[PDB]
Structure formats: structure tokens, C-alpha cells
Amino acid sequence: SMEMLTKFESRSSRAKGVAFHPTQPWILTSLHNGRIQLWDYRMGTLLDRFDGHDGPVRGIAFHPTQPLFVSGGDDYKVNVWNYKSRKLLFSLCGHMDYVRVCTFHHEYPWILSCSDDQTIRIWNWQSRNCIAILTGHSHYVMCAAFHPSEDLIVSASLDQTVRVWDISGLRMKNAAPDAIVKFVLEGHDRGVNWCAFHPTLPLILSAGDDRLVKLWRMTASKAWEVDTCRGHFNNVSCCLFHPHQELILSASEDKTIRVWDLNRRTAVQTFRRDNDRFWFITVHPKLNLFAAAHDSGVMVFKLE
């Protein structure tokens, strides 16, 4: 068993995305009502509000080193903001349906976004130009993520697949004499809502409308399903690897956050809320510190 040591809670209308700042004690929270909040979870206070979307904002992420954050909305825009000047700097337009996720790359000057329009887009945020459109999924792309150390992207789609994309050819598109799908991971019998890379091991987690969390393993030449976490009783909204313990975390519309053993895939702990479905979970890049977005706001907690 484990305990949840709550460090901060916001009370709001439904929250969709959360992003930890890497060095300041801040979270961004993007809300179903279109507002983005910036909270200090050390003081427990609201620092700023950012209103630049119409309708839900599902994507939200900080740049790792620049004073920027990116948001992605059901109004199809990918907005880039400066949190020091408190200005919306520009909109990146191109998606033709809801944006589900947006993140910054850790080294290249890139934003990743994915959309119900079935595409993944890569944008150069310095030049403000779309530099790639990754096509292949045949339904909403619910999640996309950069690999932390290799030129890979993993994506999850309501077409029931998880895709791994080789973007090495994209980085070298103009090298002297594009992205391509490397793996199509099939197994879920319903749409896939989320996917995640392990920070150091060649592992992938996915979670879906089949109420399952699946663990996959890859090499440079093959990828395969390893095992399944069973126990959620509604759609699984999100999943991640604990960066510092051999544990899997998932969050679900069944109103629970579940902790699972990475090696056995057995239940370790279940946390429940009485009235709130969970939509998203994230972990701080450094700290044993997690955030979860739900129907009534956001919780920031340690797991002990």
C-alpha cells in the first residue's frame, strides 16, 4: 500500500491539462472553460490567468528553459505565450479539429501537437512555421510525445493503435545527399487515449477506452506487448511511468488514480474521489511530485 501526501489543491471547474515548471514551484492548469491558470503550489496561490481560447484547452506545457508556454484548444489553435510579459505571442494555425496535446522538445526549437484531425504536427516555434505533418492514424490522435533521448515520437489514437514514428529523417530533411512510421502497436480493442515513454528504459505505456493499461517494449528493430494492467472500470484517460520507482500510474473516468507494479503489473494502490473523474496526470521532471486534473480542479501530491 501507499499514501498520497497532498501538497496543493485547486478548486475550479473541470481541469484538463497540467504542466509543472521545471525550476519554479508553478503549475499551469488548462480548463474545460477555456481559461489557463498559473498556480504557485508552494504558496498555494493563483499567480496569473490567461484567456486566449474559445472552448476547452486540453494541451498545456512549459518550455524547459525559455519563459514560454504553449496551449492547445478545441478552437484548433496552438498558442505560444510568454509568462514574464504575460502576453499571447502568437497563434500557430493549421489543425482542423480539436488539439489534444501540445509539448515542447527539450533540444530542438520544436512544438509537438496532435489533433482530432488525425494528424500530428511539428512546429518550429522560433520561426513560427509548421515543419512537419505526420499522417497515418485513421481517427483522433489523442496523445503524442517526444522520446527523451532518441529521434522518436509515440502517439495514441482512437483508431485503436499506438504508433512509433522515426523523426531522424525529419531532423535531417535538408541534409546533403521526412518522418516515417516505425512501429504500429496493435492490441487494444477500443480507442487509445494516452501513451508515454519511460525516461530511461525502452518501454511504452498506453491506456484506452478498453479500461486497460498496456505495457510495451521495443528495440531498434522490434516492438511488442509485454503485459496489461487490469482493474479500472471506465475509460483510462492518462498513464505514466514513475520516474524514480518501479511503478506505473494511471488515471481514469472511474474516478480513480491507480498505482501498479512495473515488474508484475499487479495493483499497488488505488486512490478514489467521490464525485470527480480524472482526466490527466503528470510528474515533475525532478521531484517525487505528481499532479492530477479532475472534474473539480487539480491536486499536487507526493506518493509515499
Binding site: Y140, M142, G191, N193, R277, W279
Partner: peptide, 4 residues
Amino acid sequence: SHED
């Protein structure tokens, strides 16, 4: 629908 995943609208929520």
C-alpha cells in the same frame, strides 16, 4: 465522443 471524448468531448468531456
